[PDB]
Structures are given as C-alpha cells and as structure tokens.
Coordinates of C-alpha atoms and ligand atoms in Angstrom, one line a residue:
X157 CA 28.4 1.7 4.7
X158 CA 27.0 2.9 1.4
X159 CA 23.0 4.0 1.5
X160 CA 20.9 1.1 -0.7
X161 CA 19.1 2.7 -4.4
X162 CA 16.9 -0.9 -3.8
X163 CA 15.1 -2.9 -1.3
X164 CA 13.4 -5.8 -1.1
X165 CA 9.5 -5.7 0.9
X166 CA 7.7 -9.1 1.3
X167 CA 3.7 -8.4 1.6
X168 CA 2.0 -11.5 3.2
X169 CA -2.3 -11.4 3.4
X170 CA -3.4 -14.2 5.0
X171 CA -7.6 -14.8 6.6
X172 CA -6.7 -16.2 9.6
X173 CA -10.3 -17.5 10.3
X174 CA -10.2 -16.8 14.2
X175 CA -8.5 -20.1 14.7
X176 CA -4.5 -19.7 15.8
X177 CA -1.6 -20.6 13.2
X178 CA 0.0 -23.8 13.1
X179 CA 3.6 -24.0 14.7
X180 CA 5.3 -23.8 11.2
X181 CA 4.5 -21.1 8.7
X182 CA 7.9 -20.5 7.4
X183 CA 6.7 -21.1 3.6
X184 CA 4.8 -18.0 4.1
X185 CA 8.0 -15.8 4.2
X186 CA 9.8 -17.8 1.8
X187 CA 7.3 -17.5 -1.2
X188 CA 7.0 -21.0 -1.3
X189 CA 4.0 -23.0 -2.6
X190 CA 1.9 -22.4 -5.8
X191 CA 2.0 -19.2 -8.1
X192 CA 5.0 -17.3 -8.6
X193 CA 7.5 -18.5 -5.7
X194 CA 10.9 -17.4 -4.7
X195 CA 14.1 -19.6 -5.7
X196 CA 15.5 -21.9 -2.6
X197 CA 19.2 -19.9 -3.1
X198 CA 17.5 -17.0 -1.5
X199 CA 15.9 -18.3 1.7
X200 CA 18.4 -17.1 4.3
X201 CA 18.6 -13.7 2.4
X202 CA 16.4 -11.4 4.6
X203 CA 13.5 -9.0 2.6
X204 CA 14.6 -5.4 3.9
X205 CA 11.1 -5.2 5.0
X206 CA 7.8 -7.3 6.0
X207 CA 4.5 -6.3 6.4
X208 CA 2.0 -8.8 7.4
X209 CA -1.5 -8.2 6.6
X210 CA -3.9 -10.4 8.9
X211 CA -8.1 -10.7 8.8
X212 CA -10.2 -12.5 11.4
X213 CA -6.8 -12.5 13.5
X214 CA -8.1 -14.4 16.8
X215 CA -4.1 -14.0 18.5
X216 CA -3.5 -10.5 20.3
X217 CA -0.6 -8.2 18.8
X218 CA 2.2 -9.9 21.4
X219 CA 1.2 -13.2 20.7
X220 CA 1.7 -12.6 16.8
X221 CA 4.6 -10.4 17.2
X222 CA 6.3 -13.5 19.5
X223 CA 5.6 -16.1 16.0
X224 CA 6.5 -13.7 13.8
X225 CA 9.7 -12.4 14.7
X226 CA 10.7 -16.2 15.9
X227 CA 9.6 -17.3 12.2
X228 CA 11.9 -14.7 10.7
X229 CA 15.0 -15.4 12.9
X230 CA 14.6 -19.0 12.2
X231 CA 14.9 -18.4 8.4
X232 CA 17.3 -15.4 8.4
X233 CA 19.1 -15.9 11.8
X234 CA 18.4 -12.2 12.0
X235 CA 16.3 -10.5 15.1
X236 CA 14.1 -8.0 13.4
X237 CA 12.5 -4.6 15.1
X238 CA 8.7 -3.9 15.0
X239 CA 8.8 -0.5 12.5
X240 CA 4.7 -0.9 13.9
X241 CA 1.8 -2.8 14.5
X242 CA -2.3 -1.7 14.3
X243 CA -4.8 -3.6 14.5
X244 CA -8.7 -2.6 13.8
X245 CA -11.2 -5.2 15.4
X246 CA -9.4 -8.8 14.1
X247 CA -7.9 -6.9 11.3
X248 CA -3.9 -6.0 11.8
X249 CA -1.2 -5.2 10.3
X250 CA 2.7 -5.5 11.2
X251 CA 5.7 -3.7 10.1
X252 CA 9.0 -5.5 10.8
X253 CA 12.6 -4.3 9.3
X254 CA 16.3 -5.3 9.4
X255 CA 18.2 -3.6 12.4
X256 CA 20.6 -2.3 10.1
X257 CA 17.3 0.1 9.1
X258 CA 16.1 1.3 12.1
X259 CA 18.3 4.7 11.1
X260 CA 16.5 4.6 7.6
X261 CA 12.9 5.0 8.8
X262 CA 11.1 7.4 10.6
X263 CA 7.9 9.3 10.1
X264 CA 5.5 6.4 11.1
X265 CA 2.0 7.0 10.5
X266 CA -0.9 4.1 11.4
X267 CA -4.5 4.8 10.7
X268 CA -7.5 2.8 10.4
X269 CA -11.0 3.1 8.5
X270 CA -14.1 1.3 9.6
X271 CA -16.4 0.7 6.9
X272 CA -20.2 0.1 6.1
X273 CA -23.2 1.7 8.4
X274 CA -25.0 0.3 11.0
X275 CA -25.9 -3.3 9.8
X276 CA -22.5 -3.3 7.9
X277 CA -20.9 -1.1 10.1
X278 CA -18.6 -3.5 13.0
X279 CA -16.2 -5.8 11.3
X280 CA -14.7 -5.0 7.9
X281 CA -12.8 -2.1 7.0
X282 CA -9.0 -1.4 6.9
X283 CA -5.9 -0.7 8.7
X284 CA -2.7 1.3 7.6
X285 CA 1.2 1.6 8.0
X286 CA 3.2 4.6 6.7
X287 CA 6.9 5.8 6.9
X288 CA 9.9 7.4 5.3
X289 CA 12.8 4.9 4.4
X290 CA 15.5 7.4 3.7
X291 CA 14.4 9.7 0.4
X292 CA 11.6 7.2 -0.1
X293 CA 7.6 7.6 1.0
X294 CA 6.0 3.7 1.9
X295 CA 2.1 3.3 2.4
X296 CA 0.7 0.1 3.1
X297 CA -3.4 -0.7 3.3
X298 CA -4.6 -3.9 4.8
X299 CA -8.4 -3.9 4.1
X300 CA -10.7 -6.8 4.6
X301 CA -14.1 -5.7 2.3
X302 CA -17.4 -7.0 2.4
X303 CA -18.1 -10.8 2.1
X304 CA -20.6 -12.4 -0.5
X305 CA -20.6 -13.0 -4.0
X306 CA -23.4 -10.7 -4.6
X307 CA -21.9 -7.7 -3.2
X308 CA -18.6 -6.9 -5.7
X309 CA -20.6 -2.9 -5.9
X310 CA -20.5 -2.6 -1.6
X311 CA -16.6 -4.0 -2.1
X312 CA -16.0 -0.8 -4.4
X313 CA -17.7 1.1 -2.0
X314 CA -15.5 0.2 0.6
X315 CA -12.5 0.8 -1.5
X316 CA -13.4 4.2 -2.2
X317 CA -13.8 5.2 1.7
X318 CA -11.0 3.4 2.9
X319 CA -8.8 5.5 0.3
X320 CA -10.7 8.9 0.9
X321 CA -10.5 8.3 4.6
X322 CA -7.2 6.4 5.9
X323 CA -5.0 9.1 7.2
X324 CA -1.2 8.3 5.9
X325 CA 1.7 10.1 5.0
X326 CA 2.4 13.1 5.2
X327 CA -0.4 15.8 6.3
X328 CA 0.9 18.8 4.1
X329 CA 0.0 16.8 0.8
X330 CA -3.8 18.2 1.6
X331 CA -5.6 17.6 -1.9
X332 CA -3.9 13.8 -1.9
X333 CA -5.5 10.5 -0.9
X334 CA -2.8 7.6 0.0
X335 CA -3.5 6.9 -3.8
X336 CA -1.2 10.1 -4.1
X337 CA 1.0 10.2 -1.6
X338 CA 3.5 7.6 -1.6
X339 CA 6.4 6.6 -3.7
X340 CA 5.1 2.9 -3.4
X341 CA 1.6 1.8 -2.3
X342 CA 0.8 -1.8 -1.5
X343 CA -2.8 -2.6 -1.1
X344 CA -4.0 -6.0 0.3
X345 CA -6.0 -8.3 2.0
X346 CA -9.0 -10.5 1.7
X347 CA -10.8 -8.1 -0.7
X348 CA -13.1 -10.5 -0.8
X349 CA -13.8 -10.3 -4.8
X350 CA -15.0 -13.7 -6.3
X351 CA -15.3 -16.3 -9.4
X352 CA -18.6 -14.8 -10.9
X353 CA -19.8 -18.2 -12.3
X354 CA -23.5 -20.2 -11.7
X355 CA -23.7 -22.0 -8.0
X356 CA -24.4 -24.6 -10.5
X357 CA -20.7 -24.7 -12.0
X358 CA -18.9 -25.3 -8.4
X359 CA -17.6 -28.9 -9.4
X360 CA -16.7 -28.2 -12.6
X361 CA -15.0 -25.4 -11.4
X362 CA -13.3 -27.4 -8.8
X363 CA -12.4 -30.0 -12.0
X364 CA -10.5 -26.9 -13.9
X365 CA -8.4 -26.2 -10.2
X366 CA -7.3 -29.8 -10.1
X367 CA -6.5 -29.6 -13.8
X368 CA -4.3 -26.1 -13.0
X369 CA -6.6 -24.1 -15.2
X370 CA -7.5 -20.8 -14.5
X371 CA -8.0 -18.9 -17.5
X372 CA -11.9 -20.0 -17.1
X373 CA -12.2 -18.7 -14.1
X374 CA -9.9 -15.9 -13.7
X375 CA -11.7 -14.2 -17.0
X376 CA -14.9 -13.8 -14.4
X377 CA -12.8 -12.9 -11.3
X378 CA -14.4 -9.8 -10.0
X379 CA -11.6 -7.8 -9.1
X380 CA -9.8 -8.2 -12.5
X381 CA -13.3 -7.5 -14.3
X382 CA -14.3 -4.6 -11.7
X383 CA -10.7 -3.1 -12.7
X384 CA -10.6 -3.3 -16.1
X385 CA -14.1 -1.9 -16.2
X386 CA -12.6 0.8 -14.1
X387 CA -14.4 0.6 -11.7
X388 CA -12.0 0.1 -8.9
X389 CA -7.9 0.3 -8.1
X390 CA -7.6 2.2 -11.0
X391 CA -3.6 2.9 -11.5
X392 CA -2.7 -0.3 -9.5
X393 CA -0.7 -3.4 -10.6
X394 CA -1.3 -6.8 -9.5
X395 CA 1.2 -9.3 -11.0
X396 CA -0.6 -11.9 -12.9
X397 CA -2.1 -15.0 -10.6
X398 CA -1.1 -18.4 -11.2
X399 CA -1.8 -20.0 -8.1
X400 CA -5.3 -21.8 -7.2
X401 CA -8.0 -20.2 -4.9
X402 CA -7.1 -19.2 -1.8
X403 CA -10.9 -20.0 -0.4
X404 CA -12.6 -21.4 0.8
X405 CA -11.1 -24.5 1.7
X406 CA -11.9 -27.3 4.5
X407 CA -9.8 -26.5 7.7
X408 CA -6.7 -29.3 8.2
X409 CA -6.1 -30.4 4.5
X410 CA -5.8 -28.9 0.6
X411 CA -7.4 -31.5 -0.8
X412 CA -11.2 -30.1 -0.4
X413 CA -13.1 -26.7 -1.7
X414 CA -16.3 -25.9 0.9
X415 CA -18.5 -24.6 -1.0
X416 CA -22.0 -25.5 -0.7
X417 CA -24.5 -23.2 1.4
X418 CA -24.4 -23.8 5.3
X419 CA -26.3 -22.1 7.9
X420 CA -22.5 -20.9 9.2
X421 CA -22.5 -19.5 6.1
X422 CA -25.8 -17.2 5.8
X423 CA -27.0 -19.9 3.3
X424 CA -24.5 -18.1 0.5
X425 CA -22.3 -20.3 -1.5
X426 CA -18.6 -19.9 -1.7
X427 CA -17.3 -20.8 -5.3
X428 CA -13.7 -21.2 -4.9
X429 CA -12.3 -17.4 -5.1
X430 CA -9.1 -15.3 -5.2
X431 CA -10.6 -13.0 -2.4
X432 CA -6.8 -12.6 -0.9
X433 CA -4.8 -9.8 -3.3
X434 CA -1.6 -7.7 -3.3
X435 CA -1.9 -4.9 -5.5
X436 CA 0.7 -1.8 -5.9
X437 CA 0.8 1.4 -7.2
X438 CA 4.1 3.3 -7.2
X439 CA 5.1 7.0 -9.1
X440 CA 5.7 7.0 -12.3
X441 CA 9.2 5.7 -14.1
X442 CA 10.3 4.2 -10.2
X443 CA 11.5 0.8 -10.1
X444 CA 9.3 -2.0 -9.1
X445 CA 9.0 -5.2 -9.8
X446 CA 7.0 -8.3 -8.4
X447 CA 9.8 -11.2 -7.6
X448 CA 6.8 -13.2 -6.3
X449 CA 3.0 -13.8 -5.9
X450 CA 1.6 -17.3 -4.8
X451 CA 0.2 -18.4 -2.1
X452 CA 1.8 -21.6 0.8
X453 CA 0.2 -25.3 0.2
X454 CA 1.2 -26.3 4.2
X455 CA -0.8 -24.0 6.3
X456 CA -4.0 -25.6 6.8
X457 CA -5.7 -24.1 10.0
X458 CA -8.1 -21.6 8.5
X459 CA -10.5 -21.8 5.5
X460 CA -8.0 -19.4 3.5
X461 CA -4.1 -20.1 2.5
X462 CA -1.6 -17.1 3.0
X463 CA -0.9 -15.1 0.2
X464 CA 2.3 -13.8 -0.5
X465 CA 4.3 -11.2 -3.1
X466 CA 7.8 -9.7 -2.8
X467 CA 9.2 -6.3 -4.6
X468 CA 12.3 -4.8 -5.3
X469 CA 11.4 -1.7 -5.0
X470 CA 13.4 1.6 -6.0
X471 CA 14.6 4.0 -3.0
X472 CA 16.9 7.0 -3.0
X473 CA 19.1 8.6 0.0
X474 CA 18.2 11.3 2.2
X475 CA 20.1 14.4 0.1
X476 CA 22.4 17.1 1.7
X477 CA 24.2 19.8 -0.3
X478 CA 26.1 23.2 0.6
X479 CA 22.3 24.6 -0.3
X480 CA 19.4 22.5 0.5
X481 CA 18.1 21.6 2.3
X482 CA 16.9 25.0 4.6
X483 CA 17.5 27.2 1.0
X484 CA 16.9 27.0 -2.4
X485 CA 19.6 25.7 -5.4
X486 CA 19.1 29.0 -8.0
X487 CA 20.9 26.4 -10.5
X488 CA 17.9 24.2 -10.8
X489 CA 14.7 25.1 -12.2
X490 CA 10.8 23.3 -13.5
X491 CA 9.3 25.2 -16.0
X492 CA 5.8 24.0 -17.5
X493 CA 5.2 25.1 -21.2
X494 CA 2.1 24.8 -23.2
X495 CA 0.0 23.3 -20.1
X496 CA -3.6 22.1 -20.0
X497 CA -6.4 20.2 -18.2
X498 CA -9.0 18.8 -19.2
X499 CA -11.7 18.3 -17.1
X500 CA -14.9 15.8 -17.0
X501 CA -16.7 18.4 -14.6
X502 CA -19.8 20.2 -15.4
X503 CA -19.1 23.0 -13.3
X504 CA -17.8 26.7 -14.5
X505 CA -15.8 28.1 -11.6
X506 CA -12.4 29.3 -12.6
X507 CA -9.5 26.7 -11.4
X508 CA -6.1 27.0 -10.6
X509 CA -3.3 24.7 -10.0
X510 CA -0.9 23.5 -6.5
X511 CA 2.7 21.8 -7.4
X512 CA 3.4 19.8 -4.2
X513 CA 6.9 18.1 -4.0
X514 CA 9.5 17.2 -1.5
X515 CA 11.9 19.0 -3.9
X516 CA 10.1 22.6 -3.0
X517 CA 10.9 24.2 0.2
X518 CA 6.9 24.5 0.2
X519 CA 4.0 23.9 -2.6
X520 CA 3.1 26.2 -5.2
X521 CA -0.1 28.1 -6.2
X522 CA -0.7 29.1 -9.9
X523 CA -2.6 31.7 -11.5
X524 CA -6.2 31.0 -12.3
X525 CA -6.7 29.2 -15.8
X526 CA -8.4 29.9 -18.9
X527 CA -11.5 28.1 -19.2
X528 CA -12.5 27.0 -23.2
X529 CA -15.2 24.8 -24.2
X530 CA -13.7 21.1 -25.6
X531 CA -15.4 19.8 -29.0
X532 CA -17.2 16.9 -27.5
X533 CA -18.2 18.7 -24.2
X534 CA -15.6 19.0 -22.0
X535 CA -13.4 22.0 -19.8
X536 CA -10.7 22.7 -20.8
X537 CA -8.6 24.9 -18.5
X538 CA -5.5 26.7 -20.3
X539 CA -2.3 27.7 -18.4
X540 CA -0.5 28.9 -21.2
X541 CA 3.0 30.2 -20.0
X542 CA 1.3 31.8 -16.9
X543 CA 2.5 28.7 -14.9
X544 CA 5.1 29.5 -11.8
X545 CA 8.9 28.4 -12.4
X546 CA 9.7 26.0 -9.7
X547 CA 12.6 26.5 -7.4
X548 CA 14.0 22.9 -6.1
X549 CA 15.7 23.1 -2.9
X550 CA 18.7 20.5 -4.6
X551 CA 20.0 21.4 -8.4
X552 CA 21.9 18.1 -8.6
X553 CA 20.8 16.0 -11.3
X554 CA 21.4 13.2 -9.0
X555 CA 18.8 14.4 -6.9
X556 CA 16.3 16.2 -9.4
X557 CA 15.3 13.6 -11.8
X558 CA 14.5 11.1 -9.1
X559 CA 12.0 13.7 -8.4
X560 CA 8.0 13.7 -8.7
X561 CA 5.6 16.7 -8.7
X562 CA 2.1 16.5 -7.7
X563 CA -0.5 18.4 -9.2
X564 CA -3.9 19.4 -8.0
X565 CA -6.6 21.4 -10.2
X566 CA -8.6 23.3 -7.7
X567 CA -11.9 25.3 -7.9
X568 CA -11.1 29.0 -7.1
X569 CA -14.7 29.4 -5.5
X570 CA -14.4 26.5 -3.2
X571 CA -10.4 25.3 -3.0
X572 CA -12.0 21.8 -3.4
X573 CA -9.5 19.7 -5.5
X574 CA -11.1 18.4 -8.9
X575 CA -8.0 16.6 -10.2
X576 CA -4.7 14.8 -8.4
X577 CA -1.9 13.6 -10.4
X578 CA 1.7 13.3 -10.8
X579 CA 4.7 14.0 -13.5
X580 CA 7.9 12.4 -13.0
X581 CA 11.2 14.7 -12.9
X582 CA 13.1 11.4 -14.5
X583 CA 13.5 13.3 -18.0
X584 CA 14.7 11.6 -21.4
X585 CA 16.7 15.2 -21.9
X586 CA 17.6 18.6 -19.3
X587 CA 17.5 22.4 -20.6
X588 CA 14.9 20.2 -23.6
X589 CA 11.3 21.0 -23.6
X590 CA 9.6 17.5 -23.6
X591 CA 5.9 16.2 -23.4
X592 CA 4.5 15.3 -19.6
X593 CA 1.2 13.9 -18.7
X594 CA -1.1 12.5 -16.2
X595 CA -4.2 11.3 -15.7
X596 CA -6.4 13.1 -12.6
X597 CA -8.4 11.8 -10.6
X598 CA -10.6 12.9 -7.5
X599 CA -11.3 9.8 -4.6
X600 CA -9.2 7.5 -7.2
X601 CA -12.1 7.8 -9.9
X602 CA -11.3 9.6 -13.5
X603 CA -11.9 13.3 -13.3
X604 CA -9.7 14.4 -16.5
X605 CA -6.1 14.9 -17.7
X606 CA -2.9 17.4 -17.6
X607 CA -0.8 17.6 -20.3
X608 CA 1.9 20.0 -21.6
X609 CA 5.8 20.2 -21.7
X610 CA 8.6 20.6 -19.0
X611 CA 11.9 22.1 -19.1
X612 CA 14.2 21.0 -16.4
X613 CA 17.1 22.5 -15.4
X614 CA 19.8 20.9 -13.6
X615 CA 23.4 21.9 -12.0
X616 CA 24.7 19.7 -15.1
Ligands
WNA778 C1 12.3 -24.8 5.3 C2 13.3 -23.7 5.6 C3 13.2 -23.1 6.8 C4 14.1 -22.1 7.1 C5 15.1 -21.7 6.2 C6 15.1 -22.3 5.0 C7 14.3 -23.3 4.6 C8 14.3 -24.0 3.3 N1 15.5 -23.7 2.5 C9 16.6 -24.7 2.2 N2 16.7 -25.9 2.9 N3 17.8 -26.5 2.3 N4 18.3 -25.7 1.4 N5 17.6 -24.6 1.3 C10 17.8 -23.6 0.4

C-alpha cells in the first residue's frame, strides 16, 4: 500500500456564538454554500484530514467530538480517529484523520496563547495543533482576536503574540516561530477584521451583498488592507473571497444583517464583515493549492456562518537508506557561494549564521560575517565562501530536493536571532551554482534578506 506524495486537509472556522449547532451541518464538510465550493462528485470522498476551528464553542470537547465524528461517517461512511483536541476558554480546536493514517502521524504537539492584559486579558487568544504526517511538518492556529471595528492595530497585536508565543513543532528549531517551522501552516478563525466603511453606509452596504458585489467592500476589508500594508500575516495566502459576510447575521434565518448598536453589543456597530478567515503559509516551491473557500447558507443558530477551505497539500514519505538515517550520505552535499544578508538593524555586533534542517543529522553554526556599510544605510553582513558545506544524512535526489534549509542570522554578543528564513533544496539544476533567496524576518515582521548561490550535490 504505496505511501501518498498528496493529501487533502479541510479547515472549517466557524463562531459558534455560545448557542449549540443545529442537527445538520453536513454542508460545512462538503464545501457547500457560497464562495468557492467543492463539486457534488466528490462528497463521499473523505479529506485525509479535518481540523475544526471553533470560537464561543458553548458544547464540551465530548459533546462536539460525538457531532463531529457522526457528521463525518454520515458523509464518508468512514469512522475517523481524533489525531487531537484543545480547547482554550470557548475557543477549540479538533484534529480528526482517516484510520488508514493513524501510522502516518505522530509527534503531536497542542499549545495555547492567551492574549491581551488584564481588561483584555480572559477570552480571546488562540489554540494550536501540530504533528508529523510521514516526511511532512503540519501546524495549525485557531485564534479568535479582539472584537470591534475600531481595534484592527490590538488584532495585529494579538497576531504577533500568538505567533511569538504558541509552542508547536518541533523544540530544536530554537530561533523559529510556527511562522517557520512547518511545511504547511494554516491559520484561522474569527480574526475578527472588518468592512472599514461609515456606520452611515450599513444599508447600502447591505444593498451591494444582495446584489453579490464585493469589490466595494472587500477593497476596505481590514485584513486584506492591514496585509498588503504589511502590517500583518505577512508571507501568508488566503484564496481570494467570493462569498458574502459571514457576520453578523440575525440567529434562525440568512435573510437579515444585525448591525445597528445594541446595549448586547457595547453600543458598537457591526457592518457586515469577513471576520472568519483561512489563511496558509507553506515552504517555498511545495504544492498547495486551495480546492475551496466559502462559507454554508443552512446553518443558522449563531450570528456567524461556518467558513470553510480545502487543500491539496504536498507530502513526502518517511526516507530510509543503507546510510541515513543514524549517518551521514558523503555523496550529497549544500554548498552556499557568494552569500549575504542584509539587515534593517541599527545594531553593530558581529552575526553569524545556523542551517537547521531535517536533512542534517543536527544544525549548523557558521563563522562570524563581515559587516559593510549598504549605500542607503543598511548592514550588510558578508559570508563570502567562509560558509560550512552541509552534510545531508540522505544523498538521493529523491529525498534531497524535497528538502528545505532554515536560516537564522544571529548576533554573536547575544545569540538573539535577527533574521529567520528559508531556501528550498527543489533546484532547477545539481552540481550548477544557482541564485537562492529569502526574505527574514524576526516575530513575522521584515528584518532584511539573504541572498547568494547554492550548489547541490546529489547521488545522481
Ligand atoms: C447532503 C449530503 C449528505 C451526505 C453526503 C452527501 C450529500 C450530498 N451529496 C449528493 N447527494 N446526491 N448526490 N450527491 C453527490
């Protein structure tokens, strides 16, 4: 029974608003509704994988465990095993995976993060799911950030602690956030980001949903603005949205937007708003691509609809040869020619660079850098040839150029990382010197670039 080079994940978000789910919620896992939805010649063909993000999630773990596995075997006819389940306050998450899989994973991580202080510390935050699937890392993030139109800065604020602070994956990768340390990331939830238009404009914006027009209002979505602005998720995807607000919507129908001010609300309107979001982020040149993103039109009982998105996502087997793992493969090789970062730091401490990869038997320190002074300001930190060849536990092309290497620029006088990034192994050429980049960053925000050239050496 051969190992798979794909899977399928489905990623459902859904604000439960404390009230219990109604007895069908089926479309949910089949993608259907508005938006991007899945074709009806696939519903009994089970996702490999489903993680169900929850907010304001009244039910305890059993009691949504018991509806979700029951909606799956309806669909599927298949009986699918909790991978694992953490919940934070009414914020959970749920892994669930084919039985053929159970094998396939291992090295399950959950973590949570609490954000906010005092005041704003006691509801919102996030909760986490990682594991191996065979060659492959997973990380999942369900965060539910700060409510209020007014508040899109406190929502980036969040983001940034939940990514500095959730604990996945795997503990060695030290100078890595999650942002770093999977081969595919999904973040989601009810980031809470909304349609920054006047209070005034609430019918007409509820005219333009009617009408199916969101090209008006997605152009002052926060979350798309905040990002390209960079200001948030910066190196995440999020397939384009073509499906109406999710909230906020009268409980028990579709048909009605509730927007207006209430004392239930904290006298703040809610303009209709994609606050519920799948985003990604996976390593460079690995497959993955969005097969859905929508959201159901038949699950009525909270004041936000489901969201959902589905992946096929890229994976690779867990490699034995004669060699490695327990040795090294003297056949393959990583040279870096020519290498440099450049840094947006003001600082003047000497840096040096770690290689972390699953291909080394353990990561790599460099020799310190040459610091030069940039034309418009900046440091620039020279590795010249200096850099360490790198000695890949598996030579086999098969193996190698799936491959990624992270890099970390680190101060020599404090071993604080300035810089993460990564360089795929997944070469146009072997034995060829060839151009690699990557942007680095340091708690997801911009800190500079590395650039150079590779040589990669392979047993072929
Ligand atoms: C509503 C539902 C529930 C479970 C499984 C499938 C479906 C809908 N799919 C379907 N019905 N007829 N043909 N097809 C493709």
């Amino acid at each position: 029974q051969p190992e798979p080079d794909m899977i399928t994940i489905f990623i459902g978000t859904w604000n439960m608003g404390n009230a219990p789910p109604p007895k069908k919620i089926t479309s949910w896992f089949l993608s259907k509704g508005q938006g991007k939805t899945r074709d009806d010649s696939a519903d009994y063909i089970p996702h490999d994988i489903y993680v169900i993000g929850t907010q304001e999630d009244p039910l305890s773990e059993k009691e949504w465990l018991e509806i979700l596995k029951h909606s799956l075997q309806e669909i599927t006819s298949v009986t699918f095993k909790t991978v694992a389940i953490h919940t934070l306050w009414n914020i959970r998450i749920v892994v669930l995976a084919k039985p053929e899989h159970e094998n396939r994973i291992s090295h399950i991580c959950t973590d949570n993060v609490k954000t906010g202080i005092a005041n704003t510390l006691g509801n919102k935050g996030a909760v986490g799911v990682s594991f191996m699937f065979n060659g492959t890392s997973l990380g999942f993030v369900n965060s539910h950030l700060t409510s209020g139109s007014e508040k899109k800065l406190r929502r980036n604020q969040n983001y940034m602690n939940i990514l500095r602070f959730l604990a996945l994956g795997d503990k060695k990768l030290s100078p890595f956030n999650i942002t770093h340390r999977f081969t595919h990331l999904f973040w989601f939830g009810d980031l809470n980001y909304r349609v920054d238009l006047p209070t005034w404009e609430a019918e007409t914006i509820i005219q333009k949903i009617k009408q199916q027009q969101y090209a008006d209002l997605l152009s002052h979505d926060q979350l798309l603005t905040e990002r390209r602005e960079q200001k948030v998720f910066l190196h995440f995807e999020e397939e384009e949205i073509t499906f109406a607000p999710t909230y906020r919507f009268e409980r028990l129908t579709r048909d009605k937007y509730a927007y207006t001010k209430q004392k239930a609300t904290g006298m703040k309107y809610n303009l209709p708003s994609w606050c519920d979001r799948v985003l990604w982020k996976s390593y460079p040149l690995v497959h993955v691509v969005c097969q859905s993103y929508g959201s159901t039109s038949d699950i009525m009982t909270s004041d936000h609809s489901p969201v959902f998105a589905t992946f096929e996502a890229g994976v690779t087997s867990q490699f034995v040869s004669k060699n490695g793992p327990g040795t090294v493969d003297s056949q393959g090789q990583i040279e870096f020619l020519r290498c440099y970062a450049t840094l947006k730091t003001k600082s003047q401490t000497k840096f040096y660079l770690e290689f972390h990869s699953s291909c080394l038997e353990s990561f790599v320190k460099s020799q310190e850098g040459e610091n030069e002074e940039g034309s418009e300001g900046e440091l620039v930190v020279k590795f010249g040839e200096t850099l360490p060849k790198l000695k890949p536990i598996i030579s086999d092309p098969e193996y190698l150029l799936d491959q990624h290497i992270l890099i970390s620029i680190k101060s020599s006088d404090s071993d604080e990382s300035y810089g993460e990034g990564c360089i795929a192994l997944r070469l146009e050429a072997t034995e060829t010197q060839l151009p690699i980049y990557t942007p680095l960053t340091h708690h997801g925000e911009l800190t500079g670039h590395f650039q150079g050239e590779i040589k990669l050496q392979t047993s072929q």
